[PDB]
Amino acid sequence: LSCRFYQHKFPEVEDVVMVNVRSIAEMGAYVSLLEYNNIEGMILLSELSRRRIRSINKLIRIGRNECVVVIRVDKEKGYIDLSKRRVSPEEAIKCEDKFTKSKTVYSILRHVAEVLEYTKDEQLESLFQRTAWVFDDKYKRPGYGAYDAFKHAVSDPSILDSLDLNEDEREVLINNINRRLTPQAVKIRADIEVACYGYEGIDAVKEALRAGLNCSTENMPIKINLIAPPRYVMTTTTLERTEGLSVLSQAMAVIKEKIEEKRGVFNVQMEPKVV
Amino acid sequence: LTTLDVTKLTPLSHEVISRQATINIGTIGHVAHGKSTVVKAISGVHTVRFKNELERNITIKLGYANAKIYKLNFKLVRHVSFVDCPGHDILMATMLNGAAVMDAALLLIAGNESCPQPQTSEHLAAIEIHILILQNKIDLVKESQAKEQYEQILAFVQGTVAEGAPIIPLKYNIEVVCEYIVKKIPVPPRDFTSEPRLIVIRSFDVNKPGCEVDDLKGGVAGGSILKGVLKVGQEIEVRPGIVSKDSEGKLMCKPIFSKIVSLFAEHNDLQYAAPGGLIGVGTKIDPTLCRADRMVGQVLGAVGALPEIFTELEISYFLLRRLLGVRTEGDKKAAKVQKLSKNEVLMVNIGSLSTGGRVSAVKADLGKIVLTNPVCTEVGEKIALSRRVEKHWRLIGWGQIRRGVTIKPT
């Protein structure tokens, strides 16, 4: 049903780790290590904050997840002690990114297991040992390696095929990765009123529109439609919105230059934006 | 199919080469939206349907109705257009401002009663000036029909001083009347050799929403050619043009020149165009510059016709004492044309071009009226003057253009 995200069982010291608070005691706060198959953990009260704090409940908030560093580990007694004073905002950000990517990877693996109908928890543990943790061991970078490998598999299915799990299981995993690691959807729209009330009005307007549309490269066809008489909407349904905005800006600049050259009228009704 | 071409030197009014629209004929009567049935039965129901938008001034716009009279597997003897608009005052003002208005007059008078409406129609027809009356009271008693014919003959004898010599009596009678009109239709003299001149009565833009990237056809204005013959591909010019007062001073009226891409009638009009019809010229004008009915009240010329833009004009005030052809039974000062009071807004209708103006000053000889929008019609044209009594603009008098303040922006 569920297991630790990483093959490693006890996280090392000085490693920022996600926790979920469960209860409050005198010694400190009880948490579950969500990504280590919910092992019990402690946060000492003397380490909650650098300031003088009298109540644990001032920042415990049972039921709310948190990012805590590990200050001491004792594998013999199953005792892990954590901390909140040491963690920096940047460390929290990178740990949260790690947690999100690990959650995505585990969602993919859990979907694969459910598709395979592997009712045995041992079968799911073996699935973790074989399918996803192989890339984790290969890349020598826990967390990020699995997500990078899954992205590459969504790009090139060679990585997914290289796994030695099964044939039908490989197909199920590929389908799950495609349904999960390929959520590409974007449509950048903009509005601009291009019209020249001069001698060759319609001709100049058509020429400027064609010149602007000529800047639309492959996999980014800028289609211009006449929503109104004087205003025109340009739509480019392409991924990479960061580059799409620059492309739309370049097209708008080209259209404005073409309109100004022929002594016409060009107005930017709205900047490019997603739909 | 049409047998049109691009070869003609001296156009003929009765020439069969065009067979689209030769002479503009008017249908004036008291039918009160009852002439529509007769017009439809004469030519067709919806023969003209190519461009429609939100109506701007339905009651102040004349509507043509082409009709090709064919007789003998037959041959079309003539193809004229019937013009009939609600409100005889506007038609009379348009007619009494020059020429080329309702060349042949058809009166679809009712044969049931002789109420004041027929008298007003007859007075309007007399003031405008050949007329042809008709009896529309079908499905009645034969003796009653004869009595109504005798009453109409008496009315015609009364009106014979100005125009009272018509003869007329389910479309068999309509076909007979059409044949008689074709027989009696005099040929009117129209100048096909002068420079092109048209008045735009309806501006359009057929580019529907969500058009293509380059498929943007715009600038199809519609109107009637006043003088000369228009050929496709000629360089037309808008006399009114774009008028902007943003200069923080005198308004600037820059004309617009465009090549006439096409000329279309209700059917596919040839490259050449004949006067006397509501044809449309589509040119290289920006659709934004000519929105739905936006370019109305404009004059299309070829080489910059003599009509110059004017801001204020001096007219020779001359009005009628009472209401021309109208006299209410109560007559409680309603049918009494008051004096031309200052700061009164009224339109002057030169030809088909109607402009607005307020009488800034006038002393018994000439009113200096500043027009609402700049206009370019003529320098000595007989300009009518009409005022709204109650929700219906009606003619008040006439005058002559003498001088004014003109502007020529480049």
Q: Can you tell me the distance from the alpha carbon of A74 to that of B319, in angstroms, rounded to the nearest whole number?
A: 114
Alpha-carbon distance of B253 to B374, in angstroms, equals: 8
What separation in angstroms does the CA of B97 have from each of A46, B194, B383? 102, 19, 6
> Which residues lie below 8 Å from residue A123, measured CB to CB, with a gap of 6+?
A113, A116
A234 and chain B in contact, CB less than 8 A: no
> B295: closest CA among B353, B213, B252?
B353
Q: What are phi and psi of B41, to 5 degrees?
A: -65, -25
- Residue B314 CA to residue B365 CA, distance in Å, equals 10
User: What number of residues does chain A have?
Assistant: 275
Q: Give the residue from B216, B252, B295 with the most A CB atoms within 10 Å of its CB, the best one to mutate.
A: B216
**CATH 1.10.150.190 segments of chain A:** 90-181
* C-alpha to C-alpha distance for A152 and A156, rounded to whole angstroms: 6
Reduced to 3 states, what is the DSSP secondary structure of residue B401?
Answer: strand
- SS3 at position A18: strand
Contact A189, A234 (CB under 8 A): yes
Strands B353-362 and B367-375: antiparallel
Q: Residue B264 in contact with residue B282, Cβ under 8 Å?
A: yes
Find out whether A68 and A82 touch, Cβ atoms under 8 Å: yes
**Interface contact flag, B289 A201, Cβ < 8 Å:** yes
- Residue A196 · residue A263 · CB < 8 Å: yes
| Bridge-based pairing state of the strands B197-204 and B220-227 | antiparallel
Three-state secondary structure call for residue B372: strand
Degrees to nearest 5, angle at CA A237 with A234 and A240: 115
The position carrying tokens 């005889």 is B88
Is beta strand A39-44 parallel, antiparallel or unpaired with respect to A79-83?
Answer: parallel
DSSP structure class, residue A95:
H
Q: Please, where in chain A does CATH 3.30.70.1130 lie?
A: 188-274
Residue A120's alpha-carbon distances to A6, A123, A127, A171, in angstroms, are 19, 5, 11, 20
Q: Select the residue of A195, A201, A209 nearest B214 (Cβ to Cβ).
A: A209
* Contact predicate B281/B16, CB 8 Å: no
* CATH 2.40.50.140 residue ranges for chain A: 15-89
Main-chain phi, psi angles of B348, to 5 degrees: -100, 130
Chosen for mutation from A196, A197, A236, A259 (greatest number of chain B CBs closer than 10 Å) is A197
| Ordered strands of the A265-274 beta sheet | A223-225, A232-236, A188-195, A265-274
Q: Can you tell me the distance from the alpha carbon of A229 to that of A215, in angstroms, rounded to the nearest whole number?
A: 23
Q: Which long-range contacts (CB under 8 A, 24 or more apart) does B138-145 make?
A: B138/B170, B138/B173, B140/B111, B140/B112, B145/B111, B145/B169
Query: Two tokens at A237?
Result: 């349904």
Q: Please give, rounded to a whole number of angstroms, the shortest distance from the CA of B191 to a CA of chain A.
A: 29
Cβ distance of A202 and B205 shorter than 8 Å = no
Q: Cβ contacts (< 8 Å) between B214 and chain A: which residues?
A: 206, 209-210
DSSP string for residues in B37-98: HHHHHHT-SS---S-----S-STTS--EEEEEEEE---EEEEEEEEE--S-HHHHHHHHTTS
Q: Which residue has the tokens 């001034």?
A: B57
Q: Is A115 exposed, middle or buried (0-12, 13-18, 19+ CB in 10 A)?
A: middle
| Cβ partners under 8 Å of residue B32, min gap 6 | B117
Residue corresponding to tokens 């289609």:
A223
CATH code matching the domain that covers A15-89, chosen among 3.40.50.300, 2.40.50.140, 2.40.160.20, 3.30.2130.10: 2.40.50.140
Residue B313 half-sphere exposure, CB side, CA atoms within 13 Å?
Answer: 29
Q: Are B398 and B346 in contact (CB under 8 A)?
A: no
Nearest CA distance, A233 vs chain B (angstrom): 9
The burial of B327, by beta-carbon neighbours within 10 Å (0-12 exposed, 13-18 middle, 19 or more buried), is given as middle
Q: Given phi > 0 = left and psi -120 to 50 = alpha, else beta, which region is B325? A: left
Contact partners, residue B87, CB within 8 Å, separation at least 6: B59, B60, B392, B393
Name the A residues in 49-68 with CB < 8 Å from any B CB.
Answer: none
- Dist. CA A146–CA A140, nearest whole Å: 10
Q: In what order do the strands lie in the sheet with B24-27?
A: B64-71, B75-83, B24-27, B105-107, B131-133
| Phi, psi angles (nearest 5°) of residue B272 | -75, 155
**Domain A188-274, CATH:** 3.30.70.1130
Q: With respect to CATH, is domain A90-181 assigned 1.10.150.190?
A: yes
Strand, coil or helix: B172: helix
Interacting residues of B354 by C-beta distance below 8 A, sequence separation 6+ = B60, B90, B93, B297, B347, B348
B138 is in an annotated binding site: yes
Contact yes or no for B68/B185 (Cβ under 8 A):
no
Which of B257, B284, B291 is the closest to A229 by Cβ?
A: B291
DSSP state, residue B249: S
* Alpha-carbon torsion, ordered B151, B152, B158, B163, to 10 deg: 180
CA B409 to chain centre: 29
Q: Which amino acid is at B159?
A: G
Q: Give the C-alpha separation, B276 to B263, whole Å.
A: 14
Å between B243 CA and nearest CA of chain A: 12
Looking up tokens 């919910």, which residue turns up?
A38
Contact B288 A199 (CB under 8 A): no
Put simply, the answer to whether A230 touches B213 (Cβ < 8 Å) is: no
Kindly report the number of other CB atoms within 10 A of residue A4's CB atom.
Answer: 17
For residue B258, what are the CA distances in angstroms to A23, A194, B98, B282, B388? 82, 18, 28, 9, 37
Chain breaks in chain B (C to N over 2.5 A) after: 72, 129, 169
Task: State the Cα angle at B299 between B394 and B21, rounded to 5°.
Answer: 85
CA dist B332 and B328 (Å) reads: 8
**Calpha distance B26→B198 (Å, rounded):** 19
**In sequence order, which residues have a C-beta less than 8 Å from that of residue B1 and are 6 or more positions away?**
none
B284/A203 CB distance under 8 A: yes
DSSP A129-178: IIIIHHHHHHHT-TTHHHHHHHHHHHH-THHHHT--S-SHHHHHHHHHHH
Q: Are strands B230-231 and B382-388 parallel, antiparallel or unpaired?
A: unpaired
Q: CB–CB of B95/B172 below 8 Å?
A: no
**Contact between chains at A225 and B288 (C-beta distance less than 8 A):** no
Torsion of CA B253, B258, B262, B263, to 10 degrees: 30
How far is residue B53 CA from its own chain's centroid? 20
What SS3 state is found at A15? coil
For residue B308, give both structure tokens: 């110059």
- Polymer length of chain B: 410
Cβ–Cβ under 8 Å, residues B279 and B225:
yes
CA-based Rg of chain A, rounded to a whole angstrom? Answer: 28
CA angle A88, A105, A72 (to 5 degrees): 40
Query: What is the Rg, in whole angstroms, of the alpha carbon atoms belonging to chain B?
Result: 22
The two three-digit tokens of residue A14, written as one number: 């000085």
In chain B, whose CA is at the least distance from the CA of A221?
B213
**Nearest C-alpha of chain B: how many angstroms from A213?**
8
For A102, how many CA atoms within 13 A lie in the half-sphere containing its CB? 23
Nearest CA in chain B to A198: B256
How was this structure obtained?
cryo-EM
Residues in a beta bridge with B354: B349
| B97 annotated to a ligand binding site | no
Q: How far apart are CA B284 and CA B271, in angstroms?
A: 16
As beta bridge partners, residue B71 has B75
Q: Mutation target for B interface from A192, A202, A224, A266: give the one with most B CBs within 10 A.
A: A202
Q: B258 and A200 in contact by Cβ < 8 A?
A: yes
- Min Cα distance A256 → chain B (Å) is 16
Residue A261's nearest CA partner among A214, A217, A196, A213 is A196
